[PDB]
Amino acid sequence: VEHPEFLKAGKEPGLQIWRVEKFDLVPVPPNLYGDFFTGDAYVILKTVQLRNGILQYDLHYWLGNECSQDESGAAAIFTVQLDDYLNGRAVQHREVQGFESATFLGYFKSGLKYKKGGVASGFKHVVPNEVVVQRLLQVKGRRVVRATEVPVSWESFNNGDCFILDLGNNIYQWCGSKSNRFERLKATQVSKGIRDNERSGRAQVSVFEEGAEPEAMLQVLGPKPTLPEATENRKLAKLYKVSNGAGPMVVSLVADENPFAQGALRSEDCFILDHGKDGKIFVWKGKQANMEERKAALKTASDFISKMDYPKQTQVSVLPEGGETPLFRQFFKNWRDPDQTEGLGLAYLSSHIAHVERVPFDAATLHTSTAMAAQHGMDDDGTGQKQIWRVEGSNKVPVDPATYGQFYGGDSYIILYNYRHGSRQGQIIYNWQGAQSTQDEVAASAILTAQLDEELGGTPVQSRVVQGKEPAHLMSLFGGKPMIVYKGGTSREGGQTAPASTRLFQVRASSSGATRAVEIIPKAGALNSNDAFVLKTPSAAYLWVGAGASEAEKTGAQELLRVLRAQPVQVAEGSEPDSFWEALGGKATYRTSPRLKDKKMDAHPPRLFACSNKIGRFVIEEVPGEFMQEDLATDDVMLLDTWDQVFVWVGKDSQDEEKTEALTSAKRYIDTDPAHRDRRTPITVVKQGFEPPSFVGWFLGWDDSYWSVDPLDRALAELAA
Amino acid sequence: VEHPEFLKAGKEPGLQIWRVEKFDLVPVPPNLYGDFFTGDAYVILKTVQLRNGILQYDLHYWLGNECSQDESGAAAIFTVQLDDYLNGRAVQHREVQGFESATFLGYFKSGLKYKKGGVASGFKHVVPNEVVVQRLLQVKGRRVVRATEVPVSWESFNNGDCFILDLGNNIYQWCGSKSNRFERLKATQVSKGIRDNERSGRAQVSVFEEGAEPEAMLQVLGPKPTLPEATENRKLAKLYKVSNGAGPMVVSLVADENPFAQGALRSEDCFILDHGKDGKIFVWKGKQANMEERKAALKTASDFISKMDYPKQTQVSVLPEGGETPLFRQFFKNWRDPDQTEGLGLAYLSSHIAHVERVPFDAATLHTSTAMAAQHGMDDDGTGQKQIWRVEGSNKVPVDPATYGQFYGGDSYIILYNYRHGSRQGQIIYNWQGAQSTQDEVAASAILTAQLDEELGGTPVQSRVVQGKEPAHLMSLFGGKPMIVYKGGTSREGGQTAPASTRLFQVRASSSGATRAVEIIPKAGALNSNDAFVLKTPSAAYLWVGAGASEAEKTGAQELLRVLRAQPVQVAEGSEPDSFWEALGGKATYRTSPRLKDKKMDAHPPRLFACSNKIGRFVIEEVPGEFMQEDLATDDVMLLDTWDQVFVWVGKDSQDEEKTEALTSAKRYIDTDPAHRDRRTPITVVKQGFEPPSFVGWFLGWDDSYWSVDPLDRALAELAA
Ligand SMILES: Nc1ncnc2c1ncn2[C@@H]1O[C@H](COP(=O)(O)OP(=O)(O)OP(=O)(O)O)[C@@H](O)[C@H]1O
Ligand SMILES: Nc1ncnc2c1ncn2[C@@H]1O[C@H](COP(=O)(O)OP(=O)(O)OP(=O)(O)O)[C@@H](O)[C@H]1O
């Protein structure tokens, strides 16, 4: 038999939810997805279509707080057995009521309902046409909304939250006096949800505020009393080996600090990546491993949590070798996988960007498409008017228009750019900060950038970049010329100081076709097979063009040579005269790392976070699922972490200290990241109502007028409308 | 139209309940009678068949605590209009959730359910086969049980009460650790009730005790926390006249203290009988009155309660002249009504004795019928063996067998009687207490009576009687001879002291045909048309036999004369020589009051009460409805108030102080009665398992084995059986 629902499972892309009922899988009806009984356990399978057509599986089992020891054992058993039937390629997750993963929560954008009861109490997710209902839902959460069934009583209430008194044909949404308007909008989505999905749109949602409680409400609840107020270093992990059956657990430390070596993961063994400080652990299953310790990976994860005195509700993932997720992969130094040089996409595609249509860059049609803008980091073609300045002292000093495109590493600059994307106009201010610029000048450039923003109305995008990690759009501001970055001194008055005798330049290109030439230390083990290089030497000048390189960096490298007043010696990779090598002081290992080009997004999917400087305390909460304009709360500071770049979207009604610390908050986020990632990553401050295309292009249903009418008033004009 | 439910109304004996729904009468389904929404109002019509065949109506409107001002106005409007359609002869009642009259509560023996919600909240008494249910009922009350729907939460709970977690197919009765076993038996009746009446017997009642909470319960409620403890001169009234439309209320005091004169009630006017101290008022509607102030009697009652600052939930009855109830009639001096000399029964028949078959007395068949025994106060024919004793000092002294039947008012006696009723055997101890007996001797007789009880095993009935108010059974212990009671001195040694020259004797008969001759003051205004009298005078002796008198008192009076050693002069009433009248010292008003004979029970229906000497505090709570053995809690002291007599039934497991104060408790009850009733009323202490026929005869389904198996264990062996 093997299990009849196993044959229904994982056949097409979609989401499938079974509830565990007396050691059987019973399908939850699709219209009630997101409903979960508190005394039950469930299995959830999400099937994603990978770009190469092959299928992807995330298996979760979810455990209610009032769950039996038996019902949850069955959920695990089925999870393991379903993974087995899916040929052991599924990523597995243990999810616990109130504490479930960002992936899981993303499946349910209308939110979760935690219901009272379960199988043992006789309740099911089914309901006779004519159903009588009398329940109270307490709605909690900004980013991830959770409606919990509570006792039908004023004792469940407070003056901070929203509540829904569900009377069947009539749904009564009540919102506390201290309730914020964003939370109301959310409670509204939930109310709408009950009406549309239970009920079949055959119900009247009316909505009220504390003090104006209606007849129906006061009838079932009695007189309203005085109500109470509502109730209100995670970067370090360790890696471990593990050899057991299920009882005699052998746990040996392999790496004491992240970032970890990818080579520490070996196919014979199994490891636990202990990120338990931040509420998460992973079990990695080597592809040879041992069938009995692969199959007991959940039990092993359990034993580890017990042995370490981490909470029960600690999240758990088990990934098989080759089926790793970004979250997992982030903890390692330089993840690579030889099979994925060629192919469409990668072996995993994060659910929240699975629906995103990939659009390749096309200068001709860029004005036509915010999606393209977003995916290649280009707010426009780069041909708009611009002022470039150098910071000297406490002043902006016009750079000589002849040198536009040349940036010196002893300086910090500010650029003012006007952008046109037909659809949208605006301004970007780039603050380029030299790696050798004095601290006072760097800092000065930042304050001056911030001041220019203020004098210009508050509207312009504000982007900090650091030498070497130039964003796509800044590289392309110079016609077809490359952005030249010298490692050396300055370009002021008699800042003077001439050349180093021997200089190397790496010439890297972007999606847009633009190039930057960065001056680097002239060594052999800094050569890169994907770029053009230029080696200026007292003798002559070499134009090394690598195997993986293209026309764009060839042409960009020789346009640098004109500026350097030298003449090239074309030379393909590997067949190079050894005056070349003697100029570098030897000959060493390479980089032949063919770049994650189109696959950038797959390896490092964009992620949306909320940001808080509340009570001298820095917290980030991920908003899960597909990106939505509605999640951008007008009183919040948000972070859109493309990998290339970190946008910080600042809401009009956010606190003034918070939106002044926008750049600092983005840095904290970047410095705090478990991936131990490039501290030079560009940060881009964007303001509500004045978002650039490369930001809005990540949000499918972006609406320019969305805030033109207060979003809550619109939502309400559909429920009583 | 007049109202289609009006035509369905009051046609046959029975109970009808409509719920008020948007100014309409909608019938509650009969299986849910006793269910009432807390935010609704209802109309309840109880039709009783009077013994003459004519119909009787009690109209209640019931107001939930969460009731609208509009829904309750409609209830009143319908009540008044329904009374009008029933030709104005209904008795009317304003009933309020939690505070409803003894009559009303008597209609619902399984108890009442107060439900959350109502019409405005969308809830109805109907329910789709397949209905999902999840509710909590808190069960409260000993005599009148009330299950209230409460929030589904441990916060609703306490360690004292019983609760029912109704999950639909499974009903979970929980009983606190401090919950007494009688209360559990009741909670069980409610649980059974839900199973049988909702659900159609298609549900599993399981029952539990605090500490043993089952999976289903803990699943919907969460882990059980520490639970809290459960939460724990009314004889004086005044009469008032009242002349108004509905606003300008004129209220004039007519009588300052009860007992009231019946003549104070006059047909032109309306009165309020203010017993608001005890939670009750009455409006009496004169039969000429004035149609507009008759029809606004409820609104008048309202205005009175406001003007007097009595609680809203104060009970209200409006009775029409001639349609008065016992509760009402009790407040007056000597209620009479000329039309009811002849006829079958009276104009009102209290609902709780409406089903009682009247069995007239028949010596031949008395051993055959406990009903007869009860209704005439005869535990048997009276021919059993008996010892009579006189109390002299601290001793019982055998009375001379020749004088048996002669009792002297300067003595107190005790009689030990053995009774046989085929069905039942037992013993009665009568303690007769002379009106002229010294206090020490009276008291002595009581202690000696109590001691004889104890020495005889605890089993015998124990009956205190006072000279003049002899019970039926004691009169009939003397063959066909009358019970002679002298007002004078004693019958001991040389207690001696001879006659008064002129002596009168009243000779009254009972149902059984037995007579007592009582010596009274020889006056004309003590003559009574229903009795035989005997007037001994130095000259000769008169046998006055009244018009209303019968053979029984004739014969009884002349058997007294033989004992008095005199010879009679027969003389019918009205035609009497005036040597007769000169012996009495004149000639005055009579009594021609033809006795309430068969109608005794109608005028003064028996009533069952629980009794408590708890915290130096004397409380009586009426157990309403038809009399049930099940209501006789084995740990309680109860009072069965026949009018003639007050039984006090003492439960085996009642406290020792309480059952020693049994007689005193009965007296307190009698002295406390608003009727200001005869303080000489015989009190009869009866013990659990050893109840006499004249007690058990009032209980239709009396079962001798009922306590042979603990009643709770039996009830439980039907729910899980
Ligand atoms: N198959 C993959 N799965 C997960 N991560 C990958 C994969 N391939 C490359 N990466 C990681 O993500 C980054 C992308 O590799 P890529 O070659 O595109 O970066 P790079 O060109 O070496 O340097 P840069 O970060 O400046 O682009 C690297 O840090 C690499 O370790
Ligand atoms: N129609 C009636 N309705 C209500 N009470 C009545 C009615 N008739 C008589 N009674 C009351 O109840 C008692 C019964 O009247 P009845 O003539 O039977 O008593 P009695 O013979 O005068 O004295 P006793 O109480 O000793 O029998 C009286 O107190 C009387 O006021």
Instruction: Report which protein residue has its CA nearest ligand 1's atom 17.
Output: A595
CB-count exposure of residue A212 (10 Å: 0-12, 13-18, 19+): exposed
Phi first, then psi, for residue B270 (nearest 5°) are -125, 140
What is the SS3 assignment for A190-231? Answer: HHHHHHHHCHHHCCEEEEEECCCCCHHHHHHHCCCCCCCCCC
Q: Which of A68, A120, A151 sits opposite B153 (nearest CB)?
A: A151
Residue A170 in contact with partner chain B when CB distance is under 8 A: yes
DSSP 8-state class, residue B545 = E
Phi first, then psi, for residue B409 (nearest 5°) are -70, -10
CB contact under 8 A, B215 and A132: no
Q: Which of A219, A221, A224 to mutate to test the interface with B (most CBs of B within 10 A)?
A: A219
CB-count exposure of residue B419 (10 Å: 0-12, 13-18, 19+): buried
Task: Identify whether A259 is preceded by a cis peptide bond (ω within 30 of 0).
Answer: yes
DSSP 8-state class, residue B231 = -
Residue A169 in contact with partner chain B when CB distance is under 8 A: yes
CATH class assigned to B127-232: alpha beta
Q: Read out DSSP for B125-142? A: S---TT----EEEEEE-S
Q: How far is CA A89 from the centre of its chain?
A: 24
Whether B602 contacts B348, CB under 8 Å: yes
| Closest ligand relative to A325 C-alpha | 1
Using CB distances shorter than 6 Å, the residues near ligand 2 are B 329, 334-337, 340, 346, 593, 595-596, 603
Q: Read out DSSP for B547-588? A: TT--HHHHHHHHHHHHHTT----EEETT---HHHHHHTTS--
Q: Name the residue among A92, A100, A104, A26 with its Cα closest to residue A59.
A: A92
Whether B138 contacts B155, CB under 8 Å: no
Closest residue in B to A218 (Cα–Cα): B66
Q: At residue A81, what is the residue type?
A: Q
CB contact under 8 A, A39 and B219: yes
Q: Read out DSSP for B208-228? A: EETT---HHHHHHH-S----P
Instruction: Report which protein residue has its CA nearest ligand 2's atom 29.
Output: B334
Residue B69 in contact with partner chain A when CB distance is under 8 A: no
Q: At residue A257, what is the residue type?
A: E
User: Does the domain spanning A350-498 belong to CATH 3.40.20.10?
Assistant: yes
Residue for token pair 């034993």: A303
Q: Which of A121, A129, A198 to mutate to test the interface with B (most CBs of B within 10 A)?
A: A121
| Closest ligand relative to B329 C-alpha | 2
CB contact under 8 A, B168 and A122: yes
SS3 at position B706: coil
User: Does the domain spanning A1-126 belong to CATH 3.40.20.10?
Assistant: yes
Resolution of this entry, Å: 2.8
Given the CA of residue B333, which atom of ligand 2 is nearest to it? 31
Q: Which two tokens stand for residue B445?
A: 């007789």
> Which is it for strands A515-520 and B395-398: parallel, antiparallel or unpaired?
unpaired
Q: Name the residue among B420, B416, B417 with its Cα closest to residue B366.
A: B420
Instruction: Report which protein residue has its CA nearest ligand 1's atom 20.
Output: A595
Residue for token pair 């104070």: B264
- Residues from chain B that touch A132, judged by Cβ atoms under 8 A, are 123, 127-128, 131-133
Give dist(CA B647, CA B681) in Å, integer: 11
Give dist(CA B589, CA B582) in Å, integer: 15
Give the number of C-alpha atoms closer than 13 A to the C-alpha of residue A317, restricted to the C-beta side.
29
- A160 annotated ligand binder: yes
Q: How far is CA B33 from the centre of its chain?
A: 25
Residue B593 in contact with partner chain A when CB distance is under 8 A: no
Q: At residue B363, what is the residue type?
A: A
Given the CA of residue A326, which atom of ligand 1 is nearest to it? 4
User: Does the domain spanning B595-721 belong to CATH 3.40.20.10?
Assistant: yes
Residue B38 in contact with partner chain A when CB distance is under 8 A: yes
- Residues from chain A that touch B122, judged by Cβ atoms under 8 A, are 167-170, 216
Domains A233-349 and A499-594 share a fold: yes
> Which is it for strands A461-466 and A683-687: parallel, antiparallel or unpaired?
antiparallel
Q: Which of B65, B68, B216 sits opposite A121 (nearest CB)?
A: B216
Q: Read out DSSP for B40-75? A: -EEEEEEEEE-TTS-EEEEEEEEE-TT--HHHHHHH
For residue B596, the CA-to-ligand 2 centroid distance in Å is 6
- Residues from chain A that touch B66, judged by Cβ atoms under 8 A, are 218-220, 222
Give dist(CA B25, CA B78) in Å, integer: 8
User: Does the domain spanning A499-594 belong to CATH 3.20.20.105?
Assistant: no
For residue B51, the CA-to-ligand 2 centroid distance in Å is 19
* Sign of the torsion angle spanned by Cα atoms B566, B568, B574, B578: negative
Q: Which two tokens stand for residue B666?
A: 């009965």
Query: Alpha helix (H) ranges present in A69-207?
Result: 69-85, 102-106, 181-197
Whether B305 contacts B314, CB under 8 Å: yes
Q: Which of A131, A133, A152 sits opposite B152 (nearest CB)?
A: A152
Q: Name the residue among B157, B198, B173 with its Cα closest to residue B35.
A: B198
CB contact under 8 A, A120 and B215: yes
Given the CA of residue A469, which atom of ligand 1 is nearest to it? 26
**Where along chain B do its domains lie?**
1-126, 127-232, 233-349, 350-498, 499-594, 595-721
Which residues 114-143 of A are in CB contact (within 8 Å) with B? 116-118, 120-123, 127-128, 130-134
CB contact under 8 A, B116 and A131: no
Q: Which two tokens stand for residue B257?
A: 């203290």
Which residues 216-235 of B are in CB contact (within 8 Å) with A? 216, 218-220, 222
Whether B320 contacts B58, CB under 8 Å: no
**Please, what's the b/e burial string for B541-572 (b: 16 or more CB within 10 A of its CB; e: otherwise)?**
bbbbbbeebeebbbbbbbbbbeebebebeebe
Homologous superfamily (CATH) of B233-349 is Severin (3.40.20.10)
